[PDB]
Amino acid sequence: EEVKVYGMMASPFVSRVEIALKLKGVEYKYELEKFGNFSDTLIKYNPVYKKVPVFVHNDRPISESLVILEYIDETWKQNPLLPSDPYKRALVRFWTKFIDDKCLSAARKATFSIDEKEREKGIEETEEAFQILENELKDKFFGGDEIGIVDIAGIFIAFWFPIVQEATRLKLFTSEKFPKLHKWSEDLSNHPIVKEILPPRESLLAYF
Amino acid sequence: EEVKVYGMMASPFVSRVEIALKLKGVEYKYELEKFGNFSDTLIKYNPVYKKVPVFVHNDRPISESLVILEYIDETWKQNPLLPSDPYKRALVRFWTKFIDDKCLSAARKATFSIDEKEREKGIEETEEAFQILENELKDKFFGGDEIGIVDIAGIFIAFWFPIVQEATRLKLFTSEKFPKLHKWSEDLSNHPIVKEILPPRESLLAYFKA
């Protein structure tokens, strides 16, 4: 009967839950939370981290985002996210690990300045440590022809990353340096439902 | 026929695979690795992370350690390691995730010095944020009646951490502070399996004091 999400206006983690949940064809109340100090009924549901996205249904919570994704894929078996073969499903998880390791690309092209920035290099390796292994324009994108988990796990690349370099004024991400997955970023655009769960394009530019 | 693990002589992660791999009643050839710079036929199997344990069988590698445990459960299903219900299957993975999310806590107050030591205090919260929520002297240890996945993910507590403090001369870990899980630490001693892939304790004690 009941299915309840806890999250903010623009967390890429709260996004990765909603998309997965929305492809499933599942309804969901959405209750917002404060950027700073949160509510109590959520901190009761994640007293450990006190972090969104927290996902509950019939009052039973599931904290942390990458574990939520793997819950919903084997509860509603409409539009599978994860591969069906135990080995390629094992490979697929190895990449969501890597996408989570890669996220440290955001923590260096966003929240730094001056010299403490260019004590960096990793992002350029990851994008190559990407493309050159995954293949998302020789055939479709990641997990089969439609949206897989690795796609959703990397939406802070497909959408949020293009919109952040306008805090470093950087042009790392372009069809001259990383062509194979710049056209993959199109993941942002398509899907007449994913097509919102993502906020407006120009509004976010203001925030950075 | 063939099944291969690649790793070092006493990595807590390489232990974490082998026990899991052992419970199922599965053989495994074992190839050792260089403390410093590694071989090529391993980095051909793990060009991305370049850290053991790398696990292969029928030439098909699986790098990264917590995913290997979940691989062995799904083709070799005798005494299942993961829960059957999608919720507790989510929690048990939610718990491996926390144990591994914390892990820089164990490596904080152990192999560091001066200020960066007592700049930790997370260990004492997590160790309480362990037993104050686990409550597994109520029944067995973690996941069900036999060894469950959450246990193996936290073997760097059950074995290494007890050893590892007598380099900073710390006494954080005692049965007086964490009784539900100090008595759990005897997961190592009990159980005819965790026993043997775990090296000697007194040999290991020598390594850290150096």
Author numbering:
A (entry chain B): 6 to 213
B (entry chain A): 6 to 215
Provide the authors' original text about this structure:
GSTs are multifunctional enzymes that have evolved from a thioredoxin-like ancestor gene. GSTs catalyze the nucleophilic attack of reduced GSH (γ-Glu–Cys–Gly) on the electrophilic center of these compounds, leading to the formation of GSH conjugates that display higher solubility and reduced toxicity. Each subunit displays two ligand-binding sites: a G-site and an H-site. In the present work, DNA shuffling was employed for the design and creation of a library of tau class GSTs (GSTUs) from abiotic stress-treated Phaseolus vulgaris and Glycine max.
The enzyme that resulted from DNA shuffling, which was denoted as PvGmGSTUG in accordance with the nomenclature proposed by Edwards et al. (2000), clustered together with the tau class GSTs. PvGmGSTUG was crystallized with two molecules in the crystallographic asymmetric unit that followed the typical dimer formation found in other GSTs. Residues 1–5 in both chains, and the fragments 214–224 (chain B), and 216–224 (chain A) were not included in the structure owing to high disorder. The analysis revealed that each monomer of PvGmGSTUG consists of two distinct domains: at the N-terminal region a small α/β thioredoxin-like domain with βαβαββα folding topology is formed. At the C-terminal region a large helical domain is formed. In PvGmGSTUG, a Phe residue replaces Lys, a change that could affect the orientation of GSH. In PvGmGSTUG, it is replaced by a Cys residue, a change that could make the H-site more open and possibly alter its binding properties. A fourth hydrophobic residue, Leu134, is replaced by Ala134 in PvGmGSTUG, a change that may contribute to weakening of the interface. Structural examination revealed that the key residue bridging the dimer interface, Asp105, may play an important role in inter-subunit communication. This residue could interact with Lys102 from the second subunit, forming a strong salt bridge.
